[PDB]
Amino acid sequence: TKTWRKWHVKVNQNEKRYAIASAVAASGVPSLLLARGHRIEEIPEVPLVVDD
Amino acid sequence: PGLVVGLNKGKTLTKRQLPERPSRRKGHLSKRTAFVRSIVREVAGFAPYERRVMELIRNSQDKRARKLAKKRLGTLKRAKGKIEELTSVIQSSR
Amino acid sequence: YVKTWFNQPGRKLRRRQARQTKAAKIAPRPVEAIRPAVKPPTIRYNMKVRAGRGFTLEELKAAGVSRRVASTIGIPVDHRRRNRSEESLQRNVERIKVYLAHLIVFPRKAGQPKKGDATDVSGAEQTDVAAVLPITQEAVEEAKPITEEAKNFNAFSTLSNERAYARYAGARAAFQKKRA
Amino acid sequence: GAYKYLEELAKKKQSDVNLFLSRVRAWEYRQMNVIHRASRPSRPDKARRLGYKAKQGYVIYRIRVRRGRSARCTAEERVGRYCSNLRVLNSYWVNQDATYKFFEVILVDPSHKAIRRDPRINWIVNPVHKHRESRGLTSIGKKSRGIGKGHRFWLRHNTLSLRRYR
RNA sequence: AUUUGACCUCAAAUCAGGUAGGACUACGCGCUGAACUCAAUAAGCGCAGGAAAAGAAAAUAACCAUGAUUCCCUCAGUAACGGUGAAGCGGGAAAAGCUCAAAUUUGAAAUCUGGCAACAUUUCUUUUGUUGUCCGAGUUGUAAUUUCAA
RNA sequence: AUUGGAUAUGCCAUAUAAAGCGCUUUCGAAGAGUCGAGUUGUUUGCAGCUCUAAAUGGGUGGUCAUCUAA
């Protein structure tokens, strides 16, 4: 084994921003959270917003 | 003409006269160093190939004299630089 | 022989700390010196302006600050560069003037503002040069009215002529010198 | 100043006076040792313009080396090895004959206080200047290894730089 | 005759005070250098440091000109050579400039090591200096001014 | 317990001086067996050897431009 194996991988910035935007949109959906495994049965509202 | 092509090609701006740079001066002949060069000249003499050039020039065989001078030094400009100097010494001796 | 880059984040962090240490050590003054506006020396980049090494003696003298004190107040001096056009001259001159106008000098020995100093110096603050002196690019020409003599002027017809003049310049250069 | 006259006379090496002096001096150094102390430099103008001052701490050694690598560099290395408590400042050609070239090497005693208190030569006391003549940091050393400024004057090729992201 | 004193050269001292060796070697600078382009590699030899080396143009350019060195991306696998293989420019990291010889202080060697005696000071009774006095170095040039940007 | 740099404060210093800036009615010293040439050797650069320079001269780039080596 050598140290100059390709350890890091380059991702396009637009692809990264696409994934992050989809991840936020996914977090704003109740059903995806239940599949994720979060016990949010009695969470009052999704997306959840709290004051400053 | 403010043009990209031509013998005066390039942009046109207001040209400024640059101040004189002292390192451009080197090669000038100061009066004091010229005097000192005179003193060492009269106290040291001339090299053996110079003496041969005196003999060659006093015999008036200038072609061979410049040919051997170029052979001794290596460049035609140095050979000419020698010749004018030793002829200049020649009329001074005369 | 291979050169691996596994210390790239480490080098980046070390450089940032060195900048931070430099700023802490010499905080009263900006961490970057003033730099002159200079044009690249080629046909491919002569349309841009970048930061030169330092100002010249002619620019320093025209601005009124001596080459001796210029280093002390933070104005780098380049003894090799020379100004071949006034356009660059007053350009770098006005860079220094705005620098000096925004410059405040703390009096030495803290006894009195001897000639060139600042009376009130409590407003000290470390700010970068780029904010006060933002280096710009070559001025982009704005819309201008149609010029009639230029309209009659063809264009590359001339570039063909002065080109043909340039290529055969030696041809007529011979012609005149041989017939004269 | 007489050093101008000394310098201008040193230019003309084929002069009758220079030829006679060189032969007599070269003969004298022959039955002298291969490396021997010279209490006063034979070319004071050359020594001064090379960095030698007539003060306690500067040492002049004369060395003869046979002809037929750079003789000036070899002379500096041998003198430096022969005087191990001295830093080789510079060296200069003084004489030559059919087979022997003669050089004078200027050395400085870093342990002497007249050197350690002089700000114009204090740089040589630092340990980075031990055996400059052997590492190739003298005038003839730099010229021999080709150190210069210009297009006329390796590790960047034999390596293949592999960046993190590629 | 010859005795006395100088200068020059060269010796001797278990003279006073210092310094060099050897080791480590990953990185650094040189010398040298094969064989199966290999490779200015491995081996051999010399020499340092915390970095070393390089460094303030006897530099690029042919532009509206750039402006010490080093490193990185790019130039570019291009020019070039017959597989080898750059550099200028451009973008960054970092920036800091200088010192001598060459000219008379001639109304004044103004310079400096060492010995002796005090005064001190300390990472330190362990360090580093100051003054006075003597001898010496030094006019075959030590100080101050000048380094071409002038 | 050390220090590194600044601030306030006290005491010595000796300026009969030194330095920067604008002008010249002035002069402007600048590195030699070194550059360079021929030849042999090493990967233009370097070295050995024959020979050996100049002072608006010398080096570099295609009369001009830029630098000022030893």
Side-chain angles (χ1 to χ4, degrees):
Chain A
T1 46
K2 304 274 140 72
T3 48
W4 58 95
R5 181 206 298 266
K6 216 167 152 174
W7 307 100
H8 296 68
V9 57
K10 158 62 158 44
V11 194
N12 289 2
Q13 202 165 23
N14 203 341
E15 272 159 38
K16 291 185 149 229
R17 287 154 165 187
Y18 197 111
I20 286 159
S22 308
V24 164
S27 67
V29 173
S31 308
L32 304 167
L33 269 54
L34 276 297
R36 184 51 181 51
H38 290 290
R39 318 289 218 260
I40 63 151
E41 283 91 11
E42 54 257 10
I43 284 299
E45 182 174 3
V46 175
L48 187 53
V49 182
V50 176
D51 47 28
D52 296 342
Chain B
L3 198 64
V4 62
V5 184
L7 73 165
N8 327 72
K9 66 212 298 284
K11 268 208 65 173
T12 42
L13 299 58
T14 178
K15 297 184 183 69
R16 171 175 175 81
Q17 163 264 340
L18 326 161
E20 181 86 19
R21 303 176 54 79
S23 321
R24 305 287 219 179
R25 165 189 283 174
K26 181 174 285 179
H28 186 87
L29 181 46
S30 165
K31 62 179 190 296
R32 189 153 85 86
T33 185
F35 154 83
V36 164
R37 274 166 190 151
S38 67
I39 308 314
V40 49
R41 185 86 279 181
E42 51 206 290
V43 86
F46 299 90
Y49 81 61
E50 271 81 341
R51 318 320 290 300
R52 275 311 310 201
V53 176
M54 322 320 322
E55 284 335 321
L56 257 283
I57 295 301
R58 287 190 176 97
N59 164 286
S60 296
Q61 163 54 290
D62 168 303
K63 173 78 173 179
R64 171 186 162 186
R66 59 179 175 271
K67 180 66 170 64
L68 61 84
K70 186 170 189 295
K71 162 69 168 194
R72 290 285 89 188
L73 279 291
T75 325
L76 70 69
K77 64 91 176 179
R78 284 166 182 206
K80 264 75 174 175
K82 298 288 94 176
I83 298 321
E84 329 325 333
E85 281 196 359
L86 298 75
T87 86
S88 63
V89 176
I90 274 278
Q91 73 263 9
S92 67
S93 88
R94 296 294 86 193
Chain C
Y1 306 141
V2 289
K3 175 207 186 298
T4 65
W5 284 57
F6 302 117
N7 55 359
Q8 174 181 168
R11 183 182 294 114
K12 168 184 193 59
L13 183 62
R14 183 193 324 127
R15 293 165 155 165
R16 167 199 307 292
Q17 297 169 337
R19 274 191 271 281
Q20 176 189 93
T21 303
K22 182 54 62 187
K25 194 212 301 303
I26 63 170
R29 54 201 80 61
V31 301
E32 311 256 10
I34 190 72
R35 295 298 176 176
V38 174
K39 300 195 74 70
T42 196
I43 196 66
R44 184 185 182 187
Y45 298 92
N46 47 2
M47 73 269 315
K48 292 168 186 173
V49 174
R50 62 162 171 87
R53 185 191 167 79
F55 297 92
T56 66
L57 317 175
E58 316 159 60
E59 302 164 1
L60 272 183
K61 181 163 64 182
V65 62
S66 67
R67 58 169 302 186
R68 296 294 88 193
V69 303
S71 67
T72 53
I73 39 184
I75 301 178
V77 188
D78 189 358
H79 64 91
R80 276 170 290 251
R81 196 168 70 81
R82 58 186 69 77
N83 280 187
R84 296 178 178 93
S85 83
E86 279 87 6
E87 305 301 326
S88 71
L89 182 52
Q90 292 85 12
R91 174 200 325 132
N92 291 306
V93 158
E94 68 195 6
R95 303 208 91 245
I96 272 154
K97 292 289 182 67
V98 178
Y99 186 62
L100 281 171
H102 274 266
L103 191 33
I104 54 174
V105 180
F106 291 87
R108 40 187 291 191
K109 85 174 290 295
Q112 189 274 331
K114 300 289 286 294
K115 185 202 61 43
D117 293 292
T119 51
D120 184 70
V121 296
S122 77
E125 194 260 333
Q126 172 150 91
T127 165
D128 81 65
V129 172
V132 188
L133 258 281
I135 201 171
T136 64
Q137 293 323 339
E138 170 175 353
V140 176
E141 180 60 31
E142 76 280 18
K144 65 177 73 175
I146 272 292
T147 314
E148 58 276 19
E149 64 266 21
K151 175 73 171 178
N152 297 116
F153 160 44
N154 169 265
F156 181 76
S157 53
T158 70
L159 326 175
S160 65
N161 315 356
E162 282 84 6
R163 194 193 174 133
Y165 190 14
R167 298 292 179 90
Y168 306 358
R172 56 203 67 85
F175 177 179
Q176 286 70 241
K177 60 173 177 276
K178 65 97 177 178
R179 82 174 192 268
Chain D
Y3 303 74
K4 186 183 287 185
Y5 308 80
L6 270 70
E7 187 277 345
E8 281 308 13
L9 202 173
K11 315 285 268 192
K12 275 79 179 178
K13 309 199 186 319
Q14 295 297 289
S15 172
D16 316 295
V17 191
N18 264 357
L19 210 29
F20 173 100
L21 266 296
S22 34
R23 185 158 73 132
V24 172
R25 291 197 175 121
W27 166 83
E28 249 160 61
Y29 314 131
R30 194 81 50 61
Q31 335 74 25
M32 284 305 208
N33 273 265
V34 171
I35 316 177
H36 56 278
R37 178 68 172 262
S39 46
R40 39 191 60 264
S42 64
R43 318 170 61 175
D45 59 273
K46 189 77 171 178
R48 285 199 92 247
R49 90 174 42 106
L50 261 63
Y52 154 81
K53 308 275 188 165
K55 71 159 71 180
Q56 323 195 61
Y58 289 94
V59 181
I60 286 294
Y61 265 95
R62 205 170 286 122
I63 177 147
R64 74 166 178 264
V65 60
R66 63 179 67 259
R67 325 156 70 167
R69 282 174 39 59
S70 185
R72 186 177 178 182
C73 198
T74 303
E76 268 179 357
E77 290 197 78
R78 274 173 200 167
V79 176
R81 214 73 191 281
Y82 169 105
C83 299
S84 289
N85 59 304
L86 295 174
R87 319 291 180 81
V88 172
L89 190 151
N90 210 357
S91 100
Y92 58 84
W93 174 101
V94 59
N95 191 295
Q96 63 154 330
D97 79 33
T99 183
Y100 279 149
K101 270 190 168 187
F102 296 78
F103 296 93
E104 263 177 338
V105 181
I106 318 173
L107 299 89
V108 177
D109 193 49
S111 311
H112 204 270
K113 311 297 305 311
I115 300 310
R116 295 177 89 98
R117 296 171 177 176
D118 189 359
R120 218 167 301 176
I121 184 70
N122 262 332
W123 54 267
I124 205 155
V125 190
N126 297 331
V128 71
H129 296 121
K130 299 174 183 178
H131 288 104
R132 312 156 66 244
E133 81 276 340
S134 72
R135 283 178 293 140
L137 317 177
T138 36
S139 173
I140 208 50
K142 284 215 184 182
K143 197 185 184 178
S144 211
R145 52 199 281 251
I147 295 321
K149 203 188 285 282
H151 75 269
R152 313 139 50 183
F153 315 103
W154 168 76
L155 203 44
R156 299 182 186 94
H157 184 66
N158 206 355
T159 183
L160 164 140
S161 325
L162 282 181
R163 303 174 260 206
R164 281 166 79 238
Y165 297 107
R166 55 185 202 254

